[PDB]
A = this chain, B = another copy of it.
């Protein structure tokens, strides 16, 4: 009769049903045999906090690996570029030197050419 009344009120009042379930239901689930049965059933599909943490850890490592590789790839290009620029600087120096030597060569050749003509004219005059 007490329970018959309670059943009746629960059919009528959804807020009562909700409130009462929130009191009793957690306790029913605390039952260890029931808890084990529920866990066994869910375990076929469950992803655990440990599984998520393992993915988090792997992701963090994969990102760190890429950051590190990227830093190395950029550094390799910096080195290669510095090297190419140094090689071009050595070519410029080589040209400067060759240009200098060639100008000294030309200076000497023209000096002697002029001197040869002078002797030629002096000899012609002396006639």
Which chain B residue has the least Cβ–Cβ distance from A16? B3
Q: Are A10 and B18 in contact (CB under 8 A)?
A: no
Q: Are B29 and A22 in contact (CB under 8 A)?
A: no
Contacts of A47 in B (CB 8 A): 46-49, 51-52
Q: Are A92 and B103 in contact (CB under 8 A)?
A: no
Contacts of A16 in B (CB 8 A): 3-4, 7
Q: Are A38 and B25 in contact (CB under 8 A)?
A: yes
Q: Are B18 and A30 in contact (CB under 8 A)?
A: yes
Q: Looking at the assembled complex, report how far the CB atom of A24 sits from the nearest CB atom of chain B, in whole angstroms.
A: 4
Interface string of A71-82 (1 = CB under 8 A from B): 101100110111
Interface string of A92-126 (1 = CB under 8 A from B): 10011011101100110111011101101110110
A contact set with B: CB distance below 8 Å: 1-7, 9-11, 13, 16-52, 55-56, 58-60, 62-63, 66-67, 69-71, 73-74, 77-78, 80-82, 84-85, 88-89, 91-92, 95-96, 98-100, 102-103, 106-107, 109-111, 113-115, 117-118, 120-122, 124-125
| 9 tightest Cβ-Cβ pairs between the two chains A and B | A21-B27, A45-B48, A10-B23, A47-B47, A28-B41, A47-B52, A21-B24, A29-B41, A3-B9
